[PDB]
């Protein structure tokens, strides 16, 4: 962050919460514009296609305020001391769940013991719900996805849902709040898929700043976001996202723990 020609400038970044960067920016830029306006700041914004990429951007000093996925925040905190200021609310709650979605007609009565050799697609290794949590689940039951499934990694949630719907894979990861938004936007036909597995509750996205971020600004940003009403917040964000709660590192313990156990 710097003051340019007397005017504060902020660099924003948004994780790939919606299926494409343009959708993500169109739907969530307004909360960032609001934030910048409360500070009298200019801004710039990007939304990378992968979850790992926004973590790396924050770690490598390119981002003043980032909306990071949980594992992206934990990784960046470990590497660079990135600080979480607040957690986003979805339907009024600072949590969400990971999914494994399957084709609607997939036999699953003995899941996942009846799924050997099926085509499973996980997301990039920076994706909490899309990679970290499902990998932790398989490892907890002694399954190595790369040798158990016809396995692919690195897909986006948009690719996973599309490929399931069109019969190109059997199984793919998603997150509940993400799937909800895709159904609400008419982007998938939910008759063609079903939830096969859901995780326990996970902490939601981490509104994050670099380690040495200006303390006065940090405090203002936190108050600006957390003081929003549900109605005002929702007016500025994609459907379902409707506020922020003050957060700290220990709120992400379950994610840190999962990452540790996977090495």
Author numbering: 2 to 63, 64C, 65 to 157, 158C, 159 to 242, 242A, 242B, 243 to 262
From the primary publication:
P. stutzeri WM88 has PtxABC, HtxBCDE and PhnCDE ABC-transporters for the acquisition of phosphite, hypophosphite and organophosphonates, respectively. These transport systems rely on a high-affinity periplasmic binding protein (PBP) to impart ligand specificity. HtxB is a typical type-II PBP, with a binding pocket positioned in a deep groove between two domains separated by a hinge region. A comparison of the HtxB and PtxB structures showed that sequence differences within the binding pocket essentially eliminate an oxygen binding site in HtxB, providing specificity for a ligand with two oxygen atoms (hypophosphite), over one with three (phosphite).
To probe the role of the D206 in ligand binding we generated D206A and D206N mutants of HtxB. MST assays show that in the presence of 20 mM acetate the D206A mutant binds hypophosphite at both pH 7.4 and pH 5, but with a ca. 5000 × reduction in binding affinity compared to the WT protein in the same conditions. When we assayed D206A HtxB in acetate-free conditions at pH 7.4, no binding of hypophosphite could be detected up to 400 mM of ligand (data not shown). In the structure, the extra space generated by the alanine mutation allows for a single molecule of acetate to fulfill the role of D206 in the WT protein, forming two hydrogen bonds to R178, and a further hydrogen bond to the indole ring-nitrogen of W68. We cannot account for the origin of the acetate, but this explains why we only detect binding of hypophosphite to D206A HtxB via MST in acetate containing buffers. All of the atoms of the acetate molecule lie in plane of the guanidinium group of the arginine, forming a classic end-on salt bridge interaction. This differs from the direction of approach of the aspartate to the arginine in the WT complex, where the two oxygen atoms of the aspartate lie 1 Å below the plane of the guanidinium group, with the Cα-Cβ bond of D206 offset by approximately 75° from the same plane. The mode of binding of the hypophosphite and the degree of domain closure is the same as the WT protein (RMSD Cα: 0.19 Å), but the binding of the acetate slightly disrupts the local packing around the binding pocket, causing a change in rotamer conformation of M18. Clearly, the high concentration of hypophosphite in the crystallisation experiment along with the presence of acetate favours the formation of a closed, ligand-bound complex of D206A HtxB, that would not readily form in solution, given the weak binding affinity for ligand. However, the observation of acetate binding to facilitate the formation of the buried salt bridge in the closed complex of D206A HtxB, suggests that this intramolecular interaction is a prerequisite for capture of the ligand.
